[PDB]
Design a protein around this ligand. Structure first.
Ligand SMILES: Cc1ncc(COP(=O)(O)O)c(CNCC(=O)O)c1O
Ligand SMILES: Cc1ncc(COP(=O)(O)O)c(C=O)c1O
Lengths: 380, 382
């Protein structure tokens, strides 16, 4: 069944502009296959728990032996939710099938058509789309720029301020204390996506809001559980009654199948391990700082203040060359391009984890040092 | 933190209008070791020992810390063998795993739609298909349920587009006129997208589905399915008789911006597929039981549009639905309430979902409890 022109034309154009132009004829994100022991810095499994014996054992144990809307009775709602709410310090926690669904569902629940959503330019796409599905009025503010935000809120009125605590591509940290004050001053609600700080930051890994003592003045916190928690799920935390309504309003919550009951059990063991992982956190924080200092001195713009390090590689042609150079020299990050970034502001993201070595860190710096001197490409 | 007026008032209003029984309409009383008809696990595989053992097994040895987007795993050697197996199973050229049936539909539509694109969608097609088109800013043209004449007129007026249907409808359990839909697609130069969430596994040769049963496979451009029904797993799939699945992983937002299934999950699906392929007797049994329940209920004067294992009791408005729900539950029948936003406010449906573990004795009892209800008084049916 040949495709009709209206689809074929679109697919043809796409393949030509997104696959064919690259030297390997594949999408820009697709590079060389890695070998042992190349340095792989692509996983969001920050505390390296993917293969943890206890988590795996607990999961299998539980798995041996419909919509979640129908499971909102007290006796149907999972114990992990209460533990996660306690862990973080928020009043209530609601599980979701992914961080994406957590954001989209929360925003569908608290937004009306035309609701003002003040969203950081670099906040996760799931937050942008969540607002758009709700037909909210999106007001993008320049990255971490509170002056710009103040102007927008002054102009458009009360609404929801939406940020990542730690940004997924750049590794920058939101000015959370100032955001809290801005929301108080302007009568806004604050939504913080802690996908990249939950587990890696704060007391026992409770996160950035916890570390800063801001938990009790933030209305909503969300997180993918597919980062430090190493599980395909998400969660919504509320310091209010909103989680009572989400399960019956959010489309992903209504129209998409729920997490199975054994999945919640695996999360309980993961939480316990995370709570105790002080040394892994410490080691990761140290290694990330060593990397940031090492790369910055090379003249690369390194905006990161976290375990996420963004190499700024400009346009797609330049980006292909950079990542080809890195991979050829045993360093494997993740290419972030359109539609995640502007077509001319690509990022090669280095995601550090607690298994990374001092020797590996020095090696990354060495490779990037050579890269800067090579003359085949540039960094921004 | 005090919520802003705009949010607090929304929550307060919702709670009074949808909760104030005390709970949401979909929540009734707790059942007992009662007849449950709420699970989409049509062949009752949720506890199959072989599947659990295989999942458990692969679940040990995760050198693959692959916590990242599936877009980064689109090299040959990273793509799961379950995709090739599912493609071969159904007869389609290519298959692509998704995190859910919802995501499969949203993703496919984002990939094949431009803002101008005509989307001809059955009025009762799943919400994920409606939303998929809407997110893509497509021009949706709904046709009356299973009404090929209406569809024809619409395409005549607006031109080539994407025809979107469920093979078996999730609320009413009716069956799309797939053979005629294929003819219409050919006649007007459209593409066909069929969601087989409720027919994959339960219908066709070895459960390959309705398109396979009707020999329409090679004539259809796209098929999608939740794997959370007969496959008893939290995932979805897109099948293509073309190169569209080459592009979906880099275009679909849910595919780009949400984490992939873990490798051990795909392994479990392989075993599920093998069990389903050999489940002839279970399919036979479910088909025969569903027919009995349908016949049984249609005697009584009840509107039973279903032609499948999904039976919808049409209970009208919300007040009336609550009453029917309660009556059924008190008599040991459960019982899935479909209301807004899934249905219109005054066209609620209490869906009876059958599975291969239901027996003759239970069917008879369901018929009886419904016979009593019609009419023991108290409420009406549409
Ligand atoms: C800040 C943020 N929020 C939400 C999500 C979505 O989470 P789920 O994958 O559970 O749907 C992501 C995904 N981040 C993907 C990455 O950084 O590679 C994210 O980075
Ligand atoms: C016809 C149909 N398509 C898609 C879906 C969504 O499937 P999933 O729960 O895997 O997101 C559903 C399930 O509700 C459905 O009934």
């Amino acid at each position: 069944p040949q495709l009709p022109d209206f689809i074929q034309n679109k697919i043809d154009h796409y393949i030509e502009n997104y696959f064919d132009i690259n030297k390997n004829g594949k999408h820009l994100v697709l590079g060389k296959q890695a070998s042992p022991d190349d340095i792989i810095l692509q996983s969001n499994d920050y505390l390296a728990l993917a293969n943890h014996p206890l988590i795996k054992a607990r999961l299998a144990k539980s798995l041996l032996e419909m919509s979640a809307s129908f499971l909102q009775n007290d006796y149907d709602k999972p114990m992990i939710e209460k533990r996660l709410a306690k862990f973080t310090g928020f009043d209530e926690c609601l599980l979701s099938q992914s961080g994406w669904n957590a954001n989209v569902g929360l925003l569908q629940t608290i937004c009306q058509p035309n609701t003002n959503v003040y969203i950081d330019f670099f906040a996760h796409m799931s937050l942008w789309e969540g607002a758009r599905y709700a037909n909210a009025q999106a007001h993008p503010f320049m990255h971490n720029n509170c002056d710009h935000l103040r102007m927008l809120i002054q102009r458009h009125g009360p609404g929801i301020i939406v940020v990542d605590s730690i940004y997924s591509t750049l590794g920058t940290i939101a000015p959370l204390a100032e955001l809290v004050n801005i929301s108080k001053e302007f009568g806004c609600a604050l939504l913080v996506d802690e996908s990249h700080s939950l587990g890696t930051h704060g007391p026992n890994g409770a996160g950035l809001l916890a570390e800063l003592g801001l938990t009790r003045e933030v209305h909503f916190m969300t997180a993918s559980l597919a980062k430090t928690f190493a599980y395909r799920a998400g969660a919504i935390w509320c310091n209010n009654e909103v989680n009572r309504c989400v399960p019956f309003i959010s489309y992903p919550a209504i129209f998409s199948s729920t997490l199975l009951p054994y999945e919640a059990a695996g999360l309980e063991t993961t939480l316990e391990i995370i709570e105790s992982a002080d040394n892994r956190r410490q080691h990761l924080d140290r290694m990330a700082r060593k990397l940031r200092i090492g790369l910055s001195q090379l003249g690369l713009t390194i905006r990161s203040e976290s375990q996420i390090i963004g190499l700024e590689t400009g346009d797609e042609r330049n980006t292909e060359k950079v990542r080809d150079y890195l991979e050829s020299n045993g360093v494997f990050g993740s290419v972030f391009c359109r539609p995640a970034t502007s077509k001319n502001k690509n990022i090669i993201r280095l995601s550090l984890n607690s298994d990374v070595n001092d020797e590996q860190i020095a090696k990354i710096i060495e490779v990037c040092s050579d890269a800067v001197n090579y003359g085949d490409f540039y960094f921004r």
